């Protein structure tokens, strides 16, 4: 239930907003996964 999923088809605007929220959460998770802070 995310906008990143191509197969996702929103039935209504509430589902679309929930997909937006899930996409934001997945984006922040991916950003934290890919983040590498510079030590020293």
């Amino acid at each position: 239930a995310s906008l990143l999923d191509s197969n996702f088809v929103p039935i209504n605007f509430t589902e679309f907003v929930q997909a937006i929220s899930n996409t934001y959460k997945q984006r922040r998770i991916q950003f934290y996964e890919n983040l590498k802070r510079h030590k020293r």
């Binding site: 906008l3 088809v9 039935i11 605007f13 937006i20 996409t23 959460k25 030590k39 020293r40």
Partner: protein, 313 residues
């Protein structure tokens, strides 16, 4: 829904072009936990114990004994919902405004819905980043005419009951005095049990440029930044010390740990910009759209953040 509504499809197809907020660098992955609430408040309860007097010597017969007292504390986090409206061109009218290399009325400052939404979302994300960092909402560079906000809504820079140090105006360029103030604040810091955690320092570009100078007869292979890192490693059990630069801050240094137990960000699951279903339509080619975003949700323990302000004349 996508077939019936063009705007939702455009938002879905252009949402990926919006950059991630810069607030994420200031917090650890575990420190952020989303909550399901648009407007309202959340509450938590903590219990503390204290000693009322010196202990009582149990000699012979005695009935009056010293007592140990207890106290409850209720902590509330408030959330607020805000909205913005922006004008754009109706989808059916874009063919009459397409040009050789652009779409939109340049003379009247009109844009397609997708580009207008992207720009508005970027501006709103900048505003949210500023709010998260500074604890205030304003559009003036001076910082006046601020929007009146609800209580229990604070940021990292305006958090109460924290360690605050002030570097004098006459010592604005004296890195030795600045470091003395930083050391005093670090000593006044109270981490306690949660000490073996990474630490985070956020500085302005001028402070960073002062830091990157060699430590002072000047030393070799030792910079002020390295000295500061060693000093913070002394108090965080030799844990990682991260240093970041933010243009939002001005002559300010912010030092705080990255442990979820001490500081936690519980933002709403709708904090980031979200389009509204209401779209104003008229007989003309100009339409209006709305974007919603939620602010609030930063919780911190007291006496765990050091804020150094270098007074500038």
């Amino acid at each position: 829904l996508f077939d019936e509504n063009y705007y939702a499809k455009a938002v879905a197809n252009i949402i990926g072009e919006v950059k991630d907020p810069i607030m994420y660098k200031w917090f650890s992955p575990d420190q952020i936990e989303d909550v399901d609430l648009q407007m309202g408040y959340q509450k938590t309860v903590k219990w503390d114990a204290f000693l009322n007097a010196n202990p009582t010597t149990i000699a012979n017969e005695v009935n009056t004994i010293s007592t140990i007292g207890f106290s409850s504390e209720v902590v509330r986090l408030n959330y607020l919902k805000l909205q913005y409206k922006f004008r754009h061109l109706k989808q059916t009218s874009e063919k009459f405004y397409t040009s050789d290399s652009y779409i939109g009325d340049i003379n009247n400052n009109l844009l397609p819905f997708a580009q207008a939404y992207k720009l508005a979302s970027s501006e709103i994300i900048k505003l949210i980043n500023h709010f998260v960092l500074t604890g205030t909402v304003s559009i003036q560079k001076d910082g006046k005419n601020q929007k009146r906000l609800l209580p229990n809504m604070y940021g990292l820079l305006n958090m109460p009951e924290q360690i605050k140090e002030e570097v004098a105006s006459g010592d604005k360029d004296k890195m030795d005095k600045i470091f003395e103030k930083i050391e005093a604040g670090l000593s006044k810091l109270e981490l306690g049990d949660e000490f073996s955690t990474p630490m985070m320092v956020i500085v302005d570009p001028a402070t960073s440029l002062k830091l990157v100078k060699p430590y002072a007869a000047a030393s070799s292979c030792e910079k002020w930044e390295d000295v500061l890192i060693q000093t913070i490693k002394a108090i965080n059990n030799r844990e990682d010390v991260y240093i970041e630069t933010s243009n939002l801050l001005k002559h300010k240094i912010l030092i705080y740990p990255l442990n979820s137990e001490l500081i936690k960000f519980k933002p709403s699951k709708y904090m980031l910009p979200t389009p509204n279903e209401q779209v104003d339509k008229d007989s003309t080619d100009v339409a209006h759209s709305y974007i919603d975003f939620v602010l609030g949700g930063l919780l911190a323990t007291r006496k765990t953040i050091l804020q150094v302000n270098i007074k500038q004349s």
